Structures are given as C-alpha cells and as structure tokens.
Amino acid sequence: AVVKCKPTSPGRRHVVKVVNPELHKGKPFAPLLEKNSKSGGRNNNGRITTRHIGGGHKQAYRIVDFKRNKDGIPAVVERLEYDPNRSANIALVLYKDGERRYILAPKGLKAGDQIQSGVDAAIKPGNTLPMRNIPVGSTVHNVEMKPGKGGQLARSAGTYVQIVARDGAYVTLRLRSGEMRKVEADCRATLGEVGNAEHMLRVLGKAGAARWRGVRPTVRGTAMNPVDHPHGGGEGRNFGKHPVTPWGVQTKGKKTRSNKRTDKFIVRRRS
Amino acid sequence: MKRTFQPSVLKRNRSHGFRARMATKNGRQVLARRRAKGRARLTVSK
RNA sequence: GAGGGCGCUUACCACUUUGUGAUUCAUGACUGGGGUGAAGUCGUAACAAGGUAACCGUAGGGGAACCUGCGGUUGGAUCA
RNA sequence: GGGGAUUGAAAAUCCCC
RNA sequence: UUUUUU
RNA sequence: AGGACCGAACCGACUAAUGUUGAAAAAUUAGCGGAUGACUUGUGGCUGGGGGUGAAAGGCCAAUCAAACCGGGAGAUAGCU
RNA sequence: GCUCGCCGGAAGACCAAGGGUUCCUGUCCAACGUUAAUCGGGGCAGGGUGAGUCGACCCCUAAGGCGAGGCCGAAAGGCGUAGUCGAUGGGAAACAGGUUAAUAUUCCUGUACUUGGUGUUACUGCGAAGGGGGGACGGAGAAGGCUAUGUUGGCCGGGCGACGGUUGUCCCGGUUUAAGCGUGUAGGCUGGUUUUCCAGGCAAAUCCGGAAAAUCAAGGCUGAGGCGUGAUGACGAGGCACUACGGUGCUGAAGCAACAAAUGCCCUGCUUCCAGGAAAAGCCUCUAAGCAUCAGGUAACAUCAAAUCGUACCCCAAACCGACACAGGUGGUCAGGUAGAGAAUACCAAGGCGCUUGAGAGAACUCGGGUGAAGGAACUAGGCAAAAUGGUGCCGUAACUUCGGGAGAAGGCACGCUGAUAUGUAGGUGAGGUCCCUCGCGGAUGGAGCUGAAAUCAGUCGAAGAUACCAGCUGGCUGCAACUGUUUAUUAAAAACACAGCACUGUGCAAACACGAAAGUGGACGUAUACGGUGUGACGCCUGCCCGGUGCCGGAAGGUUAAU
RNA sequence: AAUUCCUUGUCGGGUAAGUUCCGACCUGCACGAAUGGCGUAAUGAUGGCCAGGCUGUCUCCACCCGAGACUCAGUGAAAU
Ligand SMILES: [Mg+2]
Ligand SMILES: [Mg+2]
Ligand SMILES: [Mg+2]
Ligand SMILES: [Mg+2]
Ligand SMILES: [Mg+2]
Ligand SMILES: [Mg+2]
Ligand SMILES: [Mg+2]
Ligand SMILES: [Mg+2]
Ligand SMILES: [Mg+2]
Ligand SMILES: [Mg+2]
Ligand SMILES: [Mg+2]
Ligand SMILES: [Mg+2]
Ligand SMILES: [Mg+2]
Ligand SMILES: [Mg+2]
Ligand SMILES: [Mg+2]
Ligand SMILES: [Mg+2]
Ligand SMILES: [Mg+2]
Ligand SMILES: [Mg+2]
Ligand SMILES: [Mg+2]
Ligand SMILES: [Mg+2]
Ligand SMILES: [Mg+2]
Ligand SMILES: [Mg+2]
Ligand SMILES: [Mg+2]
Ligand SMILES: [Mg+2]
Ligand SMILES: [Mg+2]
Ligand SMILES: [Mg+2]
Ligand SMILES: [Mg+2]
Ligand SMILES: [Mg+2]
Ligand SMILES: [Mg+2]
Ligand SMILES: [Mg+2]
Ligand SMILES: [Mg+2]
Ligand SMILES: [Mg+2]
Ligand SMILES: [Mg+2]
Ligand SMILES: [Mg+2]
Ligand SMILES: [Mg+2]
Ligand SMILES: [Mg+2]
Ligand SMILES: [Mg+2]
Ligand SMILES: [Mg+2]
Ligand SMILES: [Mg+2]
Ligand SMILES: [Mg+2]
Ligand SMILES: [Mg+2]
Ligand SMILES: [Mg+2]
Ligand SMILES: [Mg+2]
Ligand SMILES: [Mg+2]
Ligand SMILES: [Mg+2]
Ligand SMILES: [Mg+2]
Ligand SMILES: [Mg+2]
Ligand SMILES: [Mg+2]
Ligand SMILES: [Mg+2]
C-alpha cells in the first residue's frame, strides 16, 4: 500500500511512502546474515570508479537462496521481511527437515504458503523448476542462465520473464527489457511474478531520501569548466556541444554492446 | 587559526617512520641518501 | 450643631482617536464582448439532398463563417 | 493586362498574345 | 463560388 | 511526524566599525544564518600530480594550485633590461 | 597581611592528544622576561613519578595494511590465497581515608575483588583451529521508578552584637561515609518440564532446529534503587597542649528526617518508524580425533603467583599547533546557591584571577560609550550605521493558499507588594493507627506532617511592576529561485551548484561504464520496478513548426577503397 | 523584460517635484516552449520600490564617561 504525506512541511509534501503491513517488524534471522561495508563507488585502487555512490544507512546482508535446491523437501514460509539490498522483498521459509532459508518473494508470497523445488515440483506460484518442465506461457521468477548457476534474470520488484517457446533443448524467453533470448532449458526458474511491484510508485520527495539511500548528487557537465568535462563554459549556460560522456566518449545512441561471444543467445533485441 | 601542523606520533611514524622508509625500494633509497650525506638522524625516533 | 451649597471623586455617556476588517456609490490608463448604422473587404456556413443532411452536448484545430473527432436527436431529402 | 469562348454579367476554366 | 440600396 | 518553528552548546560566515610596520600572514567587537539533519565532531584508514578530489569555484591537494613540493637534466634558453 | 575588584557551564577542576622535567627545594640574575626584579615556565645544583585490580603490552576482530605458495607484468614491481597485522570498537579484578616540599584507586591504615599453578578432601565424562547459543548492535518518541544533588526543619557545637532593636517564630556553621558482601524491589522479557521421533547444522552431538504427544499453572531470566552490612571504624566544627609561629601532637559534638529533584540510572528497556541498523574473542553448551584405575571435569579450604612499560608537570593553556610568555586554534568529563523556560543571562559559592612597564595631565584629533532642545530620512548610491521592537497569558487576526500555511500577521488588555477566600487553596508527596494477608523491599483503609502554583476580591507605593541582564520591528507592491541544503579556506553565499520530480539514451550480466599495458577490482554479492550517460529541475496549465546543415541510428544494390 | 539601441518610449498610479518603482500598451534594435514557456502558496543574511514606528543619518552640533595623543621615568623599533 502506498500513501501520500500531508504537507506539514516542504520536503514532506511530495513524499509518497509504500508501506506494507504484512512485513516483519524488527531484526531479521540472524544466522542468515553477514557483513557488508560500503565502497564509496571506489575501486581496489581507491579511485572513484562509479560516481554518485557514498554515504547512506548501514545495511546488513541477507543470504537469499537463489539456486533453490533442497529438492523434494517442502517448506512453509514463516514470514515476509524487508531486505535493504534489493527492491525485492524477502521470505523466511523453513524446510520440513528443520532448515531455514531466505527466498525472494513472488506475487502471492503470504506466510502459511507451502513451497517446493525440483523436477517433480508442482507448478504453483513461487515454486522452482527446470524450465524443461514448465508450461510454455508461464510467467516465472528469478531465472537461471546456466543450469546450476543461480538465477539472475528478473530479480527486481515487479519483474518477470515469460517463456515463449521451447523448441530444441533451449527455451526462448521474453525478458522484462523486451529482448527475446534463448536459454538452456535445463535452467531452473521460479514460478510467478516477483513480489511487490508497488515499488515503481514511490516518490522520495526530498533530496535527503536519496542521500540516505547512498546517492550523492550528480553535477551536470555543463555546469563545469571545459578542463573538467567535455561540455561546459560559454559566459552563461550555452552548449553547442555534441552530447558525450565526461571521457569524450560519444553518447545518445551508441549501443556499446559488444559480445559476439553471446550473440547467439539473443534472438530479438529490445525496442 | 587552525594551522597545518597537527602533531601525531602514530601517524608520524607510520608515514615517515624507519620501517615505512625501509618497506619500499624507494624509501630504502632515501635512507641510503641520508646515510651517504652523513645525516645524524635518518628518520626520527625516541 | 442638624441640613444645604461649592469643591473633589465614581458610575452612565456625546464629540473625538487608533487598529483592522465588511459593504456600497462614483471613478480609472488600458482592455473583452454586446447593440446600431442605404449600397466597403473576404470568403459563402445555414435555408432545397444548401452541392460534406442538420443540430445539441463536448474536445482539439483554423484569416472567418467554421473544420475534424465521439455519442445523442430528427426538428432529413431519395423506391438508396 | 489584351482577344475570343463560356456566363444574364462576373469569378474560375479553355484556346490566341 | 457570387449576383448593390429602396 | 517534520532536510518543521523559536533558541544556547556546536557548525557557518550576511552587515558594519576597528585593525591594515594588526593581538592576528583573514581576527576582534556588535548584530547574523543553520541548529534531529543532505547535522556536527575524535581517532585511524584510502585516493598522488595532467593524478586525486570536487552539491563545480578551475575550488581544494601542508600559509602558493589554469597542473603541488624536493632533487636532477641545468650554467635550459633569453635577438630582452 | 588587611581591603577592592574580575571569571564562576569559567578566567574552576579532571583526562586525552601533544610537549618532554616546564614539577619540588634551594640558590643565582648577565643573557632570556616588551620596565625594575630581589621574582620567574631563566641559569646551576639536588630531589621527585612505587600498581594483580588505572593505562599499555595482552586475547579479539574493523576499515584497511602486509602476505608463503599463487596470477599477472620489459626490469623495477602490480594484485591476491592461507595466513598475519591494525583500534577509534569487544575481553578478569580495588574502594574509602590518611600521608610528601613534590607520588599515590600504586606508599600506609581499613576493608574487598579476579583468575591461573600446586596440594588435600569429597563429588564426576572430560576433550577441538569444529557445531549451536551468546557476545551483537539504528532513529525518534513517551512516561513511570530512582539516585546524584539541593532546600527546610530536627539535631549538635559556637553566638547574644562597633549604631535603635536582637535569649527568641533570632544569628553562623556542621549535619559526611566507598567498594565489596546480603536481600532481589520498581519494573522489563519469555509458559514451563518430560518422553519419542528426523531428508538440517561440510564429521558427530546428549546442543540448536523441525515434528509428535504427555503433563503442570507457576517457572526461569533480568533489574535501578532502598534497606542491612562493611563502619567497633573513617571523616568531622571545635577544643587542649606544645611550638624552629611553617605547623605537630592528642581529642572530639551532632552526624537524622520531610520535600524537591536531573540531560545520570532501570532503559543494550519500552512504544514506534523506516533509511532496516560491525566483526571476532572471551563466555555457556554440544559432541569429533582422543584419554577411559589415568588424565581431565565440579566444589570448598590451604598456599604460590599476577611479569614488563607508563605513572612528575602543563591541558581549551605562558608548557600543544600558531617565529613570540601572541586577544587565534585545540577532542572528551564534571556541573553548587537566588532569580530563569533554560548548559541563555545577571549576581555569588568552591576554586582562580586583576591580563609583567608605571606616574601625572585631563588639548586637537582618532577609538569605545552615555544624554540631547525643535525637527524627524531633509541623510546617503542605499535609512549603511544608529534608534526602535523585544516575556507570558488571554481576546483578536486580511488578501492569498499546494488547505500545513500566511500567524507570533496585525491589535489590543493584564502584569509589583499585602491582606483575604485558605493564619498555605487545586494539585503533589504520604507517616502514624486500623485491618487483611498468598507474610513484607506486601495490600488495603487511613489522612498527620511536608510542599504548593493559579484565580478573584479588596487594599497599597512609584513617573514607571515582562522595572536590570535578557529580549521579534511591523505593513504594502514586484524580479529570480520551489523549498532545507552547497559554494569561491583568504575581497563574490547568489539569480550560481545541488535537489525531489520529468525526459532522452546506453546496458541481458564475464552488463554497459570506470580504475589498471595485466592480474585484479569497482559497477553489484545488484540483474532492466537495476545500473550508467546527458539534459532539465517542486508543483500547476502546457511543451507548437522545421531532419536542409552538424551529430547520431538503420540500409545495402552500385561507385570508390587497405594490407595481400 | 536579469532580454529594448533610440530611452529618462507613451499613457495611467504614487510624490510639491519620481531617469527607480508599480499598471498598461507593444514600434519585441536583438522573448518563446525541458538551450523548457508561462504562472505559483510557502521558503530567501536574495534585487528593486513604498508606508508606519524610530532615531545625531541629517539641519547643527553640544555636553559628559572611558582608552590613546600630551609631560615624567624604564626599555625601544620600522618603512626610507
Ligand atoms: Mg540525475
Ligand atoms: Mg561555472
Ligand atoms: Mg566571468
Ligand atoms: Mg548567452
Ligand atoms: Mg468602469
Ligand atoms: Mg453553404
Ligand atoms: Mg453541407
Ligand atoms: Mg457527427
Ligand atoms: Mg528544523
Ligand atoms: Mg561574531
Ligand atoms: Mg534556530
Ligand atoms: Mg594552499
Ligand atoms: Mg622543480
Ligand atoms: Mg642541457
Ligand atoms: Mg640561468
Ligand atoms: Mg631586564
Ligand atoms: Mg614553579
Ligand atoms: Mg627555572
Ligand atoms: Mg612470494
Ligand atoms: Mg597484497
Ligand atoms: Mg591479532
Ligand atoms: Mg582503544
Ligand atoms: Mg600534584
Ligand atoms: Mg585443583
Ligand atoms: Mg562459534
Ligand atoms: Mg537523595
Ligand atoms: Mg548596640
Ligand atoms: Mg540552620
Ligand atoms: Mg597526576
Ligand atoms: Mg602577558
Ligand atoms: Mg594564548
Ligand atoms: Mg554565562
Ligand atoms: Mg534630538
Ligand atoms: Mg534624498
Ligand atoms: Mg540630498
Ligand atoms: Mg541596519
Ligand atoms: Mg541598537
Ligand atoms: Mg523589474
Ligand atoms: Mg534557493
Ligand atoms: Mg571569500
Ligand atoms: Mg562573503
Ligand atoms: Mg539514472
Ligand atoms: Mg537549469
Ligand atoms: Mg521619498
Ligand atoms: Mg514596467
Ligand atoms: Mg520543442
Ligand atoms: Mg532562452
Ligand atoms: Mg527554469
Ligand atoms: Mg538557505
């Protein structure tokens, strides 16, 4: 559920929260945690390598089972938590054999629900299953890319990949981005749409929110002086440049995409 | 006003200390130079 | 002496004063439309099947009447 | 612009300058 | 497509 | 509840006078902004020179920065004084 | 030595960082000291820092640093595995008093605590670089309990007034006590115990986890403070003695209560929110390889041990960074009395000070102030600067408005003291007594005593009662920018940057992009509801035409075209 | 007009008088749609303009309280 904030003060007037009751309150499941430590957007040579990264709240990491094995053993999702490291929500699961694990959080989620993964596995929202055994047309969560690896496609609040055709030993998928891409079919993949989706609708409302989210400000090239970024200068505003990256690297449609090594798998590019 | 020399022996030793000098081809070269000039205090100690 | 008057004092209150509002008349550079005016310009939308049937509601567009879109009406002509 | 056609006469339009 | 006033 | 209001600490630095061989190589005095936040601050760590860093001023990088400092090429070169 | 004055959330007092003998005593004065100097943070001697429990070393990890092998790379070297370092964080223990010229939680008195070795005696499955638990965690907010602390009285000792009064509802002061040990409260959290079973916990487990039943309702953690004890003592005004007039001996009164009360503590709690909040060791337990009369394990008592380094002094500064005995700079900890809303402020306490050139004079002029006839923005580029407003309560408050706002708009009235209602009220605290009781740090009923605003009425002094210090001026039009924010340390704080929001655009993950001739690494332990780039810059109404030129995308038929 | 040369544009308002202000026109030297356009409550040590209070800002100064300047003593510079 999303909420507007009364304007008892500017920098609140535009806020829009996305509050979810059915979330857990307070600390998460300790043993499934570990350190994180920010980076600053800086390398292992200490140089800023991605700009705009720094500050922001503390953040402890949840382990999150992506590969989804535990074949045969069902589980029962005890609750739904908040993960800080993703837009996605989280599901503490608990297996019959007495083992707990973190799993993403399909669109049905809900505590009480029953989960299961493996070739058998009944096709039900939130269950994992090599795609070979999944009706063509199904909508599918976090998708593995190489059978066994871990799942990497559609990990985000609201995402989902439709299977479109499975001729050959490969599946062809309609990614969220719109590209159509062949995949090994023996690749696992969870059922349903990834959880939340209200996400889109948040507003922040004030600079601070973003600040306390890890995002420093971005200074426009054109504000700078030539020596700094390819733009900038001119007595007052101006431009007359050819929109490029601060490293003279040309922009506005340049694709940069360059594989050959994975071309095959791309059936139809996004539009 | 706040001047530029804010003493600190921890950093002092860490940054220009004997072992830090000694911990690199070029530091080592510094000591060589000073020993060669006959300096009386290679690095700064107790 | 008692009482009284003058005075002083308290209440009520007329002028009068400050602040800020309501209302109403006259007024105003400039500006939008409306009405009137024997023979101006430009097109010619309606009246007949008015040469794209018309009109109402409504929204965008256009020197202008108006054009186009959507639903409704017939207060529409033809053996369609 | 001029000429003729066509108009009841204009305009448009066609042929001769 | 137009055909001044009474 | 709040980059909310008033206001010390604390962080800043809008006006003025004094100072200007100063008490001070940027301050004092009176007023001034912020003041639960994009707040402030201790210690320690990383980023190094056409390199860093920069809510961008060409600002900051040990009292200097349109390319630091130290040493060397080096008695650069100087149709100039 | 007597006064006077200044600071008193410091101009006091402690710690750190830094200094590094500046500390104490003598003694000297050239030079150092903005003068003299007899004095000094100067010279020269000499003295001075005493620890199981304060700190460090030390175990433990962070960021990050180093790194056998290793990958990389002309050489130099770059990066990383195991590991190994690194505190600003986690980890056993000591309080009160007394003493030196100068050291003390270190010496002495008194009284405690920690964990190890050895022994003896009973009682016993103990054991890992491993498993589990714990350690172990954000912000805001809201009271309850309490202590530190203070006020009044009681108590005790002392007092009876330089000038009218002052043996009483009078004056001054003191009225203090630690850890540890015992109790286990206010109050916070969680149902307990037993047996069976298991696809989990890299091996296993008697642990945790999961699942089954069975059986009890009260059980276990946690916890300020109080009370007791420590204290038979320490402290303690004041005495009585000696004095080499600095002080040294001996002695010793009362030593309670009510009220108020933190920003300390219970509270690593509670309620709640979102931005969702270190690691590891110690510690508890589980077992493995192991030892199985042993060895280890538990407990009480006895004993030995607890090293080494630091420990003077300056500390928001005359001892540090500022060339100086420099109005600058400098992290944390304490927090008394009256008035206050208060860590503002004014006056004081404890404590520390009068700023290391003075004496006169009492011009212009400059600096910093105080008052000002009439006038009152005439000033000037500009009301710069001055002047003015200045608390609380209550009534009252326009356009506009994104329905919060604008508002503290504006504008008014009240504000001292005394009496009364009420020799001190509403409120607050709460002792006797009475009873009850699962028995006391219990409950109830009780209202003594303590404490205490606010109102109204009535009276009264001055010119003036928010009587000082403190402490908004307000209003009307309009440019820009939404807003808080950021900026040219040192002539620019803004209309510049930023910004939430919008748009274009790239990126399918070994991503695009960036750091690096690489390995490696940031992006991201993310994955198109994400990540980069660029432009705009809240919100409202909206964003038209032009693809020639320049850039960019798509396109091959042909023409042209490199090495070969 | 943060854009406008001519320019103190012209009319309106305000003032005794107004090259600024506000309101209009529009003859836009040389506005205009995310090189965003045009509005906008609130915010602002932001620019422009007016009005009340208030005043040594000023007519036009005066007096007073302090620190220097001046004389004495000790020390004792500097720019040139
Ligand atoms: Mg951006
Ligand atoms: Mg610029
Ligand atoms: Mg310029
Ligand atoms: Mg320009
Ligand atoms: Mg009218
Ligand atoms: Mg018609
Ligand atoms: Mg028609
Ligand atoms: Mg129609
Ligand atoms: Mg605020
Ligand atoms: Mg100041
Ligand atoms: Mg404030
Ligand atoms: Mg500099
Ligand atoms: Mg050089
Ligand atoms: Mg040469
Ligand atoms: Mg030369
Ligand atoms: Mg002398
Ligand atoms: Mg001394
Ligand atoms: Mg000395
Ligand atoms: Mg090696
Ligand atoms: Mg390395
Ligand atoms: Mg270590
Ligand atoms: Mg430490
Ligand atoms: Mg001492
Ligand atoms: Mg033993
Ligand atoms: Mg462990
Ligand atoms: Mg008490
Ligand atoms: Mg007498
Ligand atoms: Mg008394
Ligand atoms: Mg000491
Ligand atoms: Mg001095
Ligand atoms: Mg000083
Ligand atoms: Mg004060
Ligand atoms: Mg006057
Ligand atoms: Mg004037
Ligand atoms: Mg004048
Ligand atoms: Mg002023
Ligand atoms: Mg003033
Ligand atoms: Mg203007
Ligand atoms: Mg702004
Ligand atoms: Mg400046
Ligand atoms: Mg400035
Ligand atoms: Mg982006
Ligand atoms: Mg802009
Ligand atoms: Mg005037
Ligand atoms: Mg105008
Ligand atoms: Mg456009
Ligand atoms: Mg423009
Ligand atoms: Mg704009
Ligand atoms: Mg601001």
Cβ contacts of A129 within 8 Å, gap of 6 or more: A117, A118, A119, A121, A123, A188, A189, A190, A191
Angstrom distance (rounded) from CA A157 to CA A118: 25
Using alpha carbons, select from A91, A96, A104, A98 the residue that is nearest to residue A73: A96
Going from N- to C-terminal start, the domains of chain B cover 1-46
Show the tokens assigned to A177.
């981005």
Amino acid identity at B9: V
Pairing type for strands A244-245 and A180-183 reads unpaired
Strands (E), A2-118: 2-4, 16-18, 33-34, 61-62, 79-82, 89-92, 102-103
CA angle in degrees (0–180, nearest 5) for A246-A248-A251: 85
Distance A146 CA to ligand 37 centre (A): 79
Show the tokens assigned to A239.
């431009």
The alpha-helical segments, DSSP class H, found in chain A are 207-211
Angstrom distance (rounded) from CA A239 to CA A137: 49
**Residue B29, CA distances (Å) to B11, B21, B23 in order:** 21, 8, 11
Distance B6 CA to ligand 18 centre (A): 28
Q: Which ligand is nearest to the CA of A237?
A: 4
Q: Which nucleotide is nearest to A55 (CA to C1')?
A: F38
Strand H at less than 7 A from CB of A239? yes
A202 phi and psi angles, rounded to 5 deg: -70, 165
Q: Which nucleotide is nearest to A239 (CA to C1')?
A: H35
In the PDB record, what is the listed experimental method? X-ray
> Do residues A90 and A82 lie in contact, with contact meaning Cβ atoms separated by under 8 Å?
yes
Distance G242 C1' – A271 CA (angstroms): 112
Q: Which nucleotide is nearest to A81 (CA to C1')?
A: G276
Cβ contacts of A32 within 8 Å, gap of 6 or more: A62, A63, A100, A101, A102
- Of the options 4.10.950.10, 3.60.15.10, 3.40.309.10, 2.40.160.20, the CATH number for the domain spanning A195-271: 4.10.950.10
Cβ contacts of A259 within 8 Å, gap of 6 or more: none
Angstrom distance (rounded) from CA A194 to CA A200: 13
Strand F at less than 7 A from CB of A223? yes
In the numeric block, the tokens 């490291």 are attached to: A85
Architecture in CATH of A1-113: Beta Barrel (2.40)
Show the tokens assigned to A190.
């969870």
**Residue A200, CA distances (Å) to A19, A47, A52, A157, A174 in order:** 13, 33, 21, 8, 21
Distance G51 C1' – B8 CA (angstroms): 28
Architecture in CATH of B1-46: Orthogonal Bundle (1.10)
Distance G433 C1' – A4 CA (angstroms): 64
Going from N- to C-terminal start, the domains of chain A cover 1-113, 117-194, 195-271
SS3 A191: coil
Angstrom distance (rounded) from CA A2 to CA A157: 15
Q: Which nucleotide is nearest to A23 (CA to C1')?
A: G276
CA angle in degrees (0–180, nearest 5) for A140-A145-A147: 95
Pairing type for strands A2-4 and A16-18 reads antiparallel
Distance F37 C1' – A77 CA (angstroms): 39
Angstrom distance (rounded) from CA A261 to CA B5: 57
Q: Point out the residue nearest to G322 (C-alpha to C1').
A: B3
Strand F at less than 7 A from CB of B11? yes
Angstrom distance (rounded) from CA A147 to CA A189: 10
Angstrom distance (rounded) from CA B39 to CA A188: 71
How buried is A254 (Cβ within 10 angstroms: 0-12 exposed, 13-18 middle, 19+ buried)?
exposed
CA angle in degrees (0–180, nearest 5) for A194-A200-A203: 145
Cβ contacts of A74 within 8 Å, gap of 6 or more: A95, A96, A114, A115, A116
Pairing type for strands A61-62 and A79-82 reads unpaired
Give the H or E element holding residue A38: none
> Do residues A157 and A88 lie in contact, with contact meaning Cβ atoms separated by under 8 Å?
yes
Show the tokens assigned to A140.
């599918």
> Do residues A190 and A151 lie in contact, with contact meaning Cβ atoms separated by under 8 Å?
yes
C-alpha R_g of chain A? 22
Q: Which nucleotide is nearest to A242 (CA to C1')?
A: G551
Distance G162 C1' – A4 CA (angstroms): 83
Amino acid identity at A104: L
Show the tokens assigned to B21.
């000098």
**Please, what sign has the CA dihedral across residues A56, A59, A61, A62?**
negative
Nucleotides of G under 7 A from a protein CB: 17-19, 62-65, 76-77, 79-80, 87, 132-134, 136-138, 198-201, 209-210, 273-279, 320-322, 328-330, 402-404, 482-484, 496-501, 504-516, 520-539, 550-554
